[PDB]
Design an enzyme around this catalytic site. Structure first.
Site, short mmCIF file in Angstrom:
data_model
loop_
_atom_site.label_atom_id
_atom_site.label_comp_id
_atom_site.label_asym_id
_atom_site.label_seq_id
_atom_site.Cartn_x
_atom_site.Cartn_y
_atom_site.Cartn_z
CG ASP A 93 36.30 32.16 38.10
OD1 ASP A 93 35.35 32.91 37.75
OD2 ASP A 93 36.59 31.93 39.30
N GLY A 181 36.05 37.64 48.72
CA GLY A 181 36.05 39.08 48.53
C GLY A 181 37.22 39.61 47.73
C1 LIG Z 1 39.88 33.91 46.00
C2 LIG Z 1 39.60 32.76 46.98
N1 LIG Z 1 40.65 32.24 47.58
C3 LIG Z 1 40.54 31.22 48.43
N2 LIG Z 1 41.70 30.71 49.00
C4 LIG Z 1 39.28 30.71 48.75
C5 LIG Z 1 38.18 31.26 48.14
C6 LIG Z 1 38.32 32.30 47.26
C7 LIG Z 1 37.05 32.93 46.61
N3 LIG Z 1 36.51 32.16 45.52
C8 LIG Z 1 35.15 31.77 45.46
O1 LIG Z 1 34.48 32.05 46.35
C9 LIG Z 1 34.63 30.98 44.28
C10 LIG Z 1 33.28 30.78 43.97
N4 LIG Z 1 33.26 30.08 42.88
N5 LIG Z 1 34.47 29.79 42.45
C11 LIG Z 1 35.33 30.36 43.30
C12 LIG Z 1 34.86 29.05 41.26
C13 LIG Z 1 35.76 27.80 41.52
C14 LIG Z 1 37.06 27.69 41.02
C15 LIG Z 1 37.84 26.54 41.20
C16 LIG Z 1 37.30 25.47 41.90
C17 LIG Z 1 38.16 24.19 42.11
N6 LIG Z 1 38.97 23.97 40.94
C18 LIG Z 1 40.30 24.14 40.82
C19 LIG Z 1 40.69 23.83 39.58
C20 LIG Z 1 39.53 23.49 38.92
N7 LIG Z 1 38.54 23.58 39.77
C21 LIG Z 1 36.00 25.57 42.41
C22 LIG Z 1 35.22 26.72 42.21
O2 LIG Z 1 33.93 26.85 42.73
C23 LIG Z 1 33.36 25.92 43.66
C24 LIG Z 1 33.00 26.72 44.96
C25 LIG Z 1 34.20 27.63 45.41
C26 LIG Z 1 34.30 27.88 46.91
C27 LIG Z 1 35.34 28.64 47.41
C28 LIG Z 1 35.35 29.03 48.89
C29 LIG Z 1 36.66 29.71 49.28
O3 LIG Z 1 36.88 30.84 48.38
#
Ligand SMILES: Cc1nc(N)cc2c1CNC(=O)c1cnn(c1)Cc1ccc(Cn3cccn3)cc1OCCC/C=C/CCO2
Length: 231
Positions: A93, A181
């Site tokens: 990412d 955000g």
């Molecule tokens: C920066 C941040 N912090 C927190 N605590 C929560 C956040 C967030 C904000 N982050 C996001 O909204 C966001 C959207 N896509 N993604 C993150 C990519 C993502 C990364 C990791 C993973 C899980 N993983 C961990 C290790 C391997 N996989 C999943 C990902 O995408 C699936 C959808 C993500 C949804 C996130 C909703 C909440 O967003």
């Protein structure tokens, strides 16, 4: 940022706001200035439609409400999303943005040094939600959060693979974290009296929950990629 407080001018001079201007203009993600013409952010910030000539990058800013038509901004010349990033998944990412013009370094906008160590004194900053179901915050927020080992982070997220290319930070009982955000912004730590960019804000399960650390892209594990793409 959950559990943070307001930052001051010049405190985090590499922090940028990535905005999209359509009819209205809105902050979508953070980023880190790493050179005159380069910003590092999260790949997932670009998951939406790949619209042309809509992004505006603001540097040297503290409060989003201060942005008006006369506020200077940078534009995107090139977006370089890591080749192995996949939508809705955690790996790789990370994205580089090449700006259309070099930014001058000033009192209020300066690059964060890239990593080449057990880091103490780590901070995460941004304009993201202050609570799980919250809203963008006007004044740039800051919070001090400890790193956790990858073994500990993996124990907290046994439903995912926490790789050596990720770094996690959080408190056992929660309450302080990045949130929506804040994505793409910096996780910085002190070393030798100097700030270094250790992580790119990426993900968590909820925000600031107990035993659910924030997951960040570990910048040191992408240095070969950064150097290749910027040279
Ligand atoms: C920066 C941040 N912090 C927190 N605590 C929560 C956040 C967030 C904000 N982050 C996001 O909204 C966001 C959207 N896509 N993604 C993150 C990519 C993502 C990364 C990791 C993973 C899980 N993983 C961990 C290790 C391997 N996989 C999943 C990902 O995408 C699936 C959808 C993500 C949804 C996130 C909703 C909440 O967003």
């Amino acid at each position: 940022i959950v559990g943070g407080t307001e930052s001051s001018w010049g405190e985090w001079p590499w922090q940028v706001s990535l905005q999209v201007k359509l009819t209205a203009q809105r902050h979508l993600c953070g980023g880190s200035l790493i050179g005159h013409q380069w910003v590092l952010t999260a790949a997932h910030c670009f998951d939406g439609l790949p619209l042309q000539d809509v992004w505006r990058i603001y540097s040297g800013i503290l409060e989003l409400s201060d942005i008006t038509k006369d506020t200077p901004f940078s534009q995107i010349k090139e977006i370089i999303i890591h080749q192995n990033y996949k939508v809705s998944e955690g790996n790789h990412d990370i994205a580089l943005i090449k700006l259309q013009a070099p930014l001058e370094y000033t009192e209020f906008q300066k690059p964060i040094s890239l990593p080449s160590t057990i880091y103490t004194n780590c901070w995460v900053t941004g304009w993201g939600f202050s609570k799980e179901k919250g809203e963008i915050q006007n004044i740039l927020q800051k919070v001090n959060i400890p790193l956790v080992t990858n073994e500990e982070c993996q124990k907290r997220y046994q439903d995912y693979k926490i790789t050596q290319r990720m770094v996690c930070a959080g408190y056992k009982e929660g309450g302080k974290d990045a949130c929506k955000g804040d994505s793409g912004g910096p996780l910085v730590c002190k070393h030798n009296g100097m700030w270094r960019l250790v992580g790119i804000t990426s993900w968590g399960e909820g925000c600031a929950r107990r035993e659910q650390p924030g997951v960040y892209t570990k910048v040191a594990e992408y240095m070969d990629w950064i150097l290749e793409k910027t040279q």
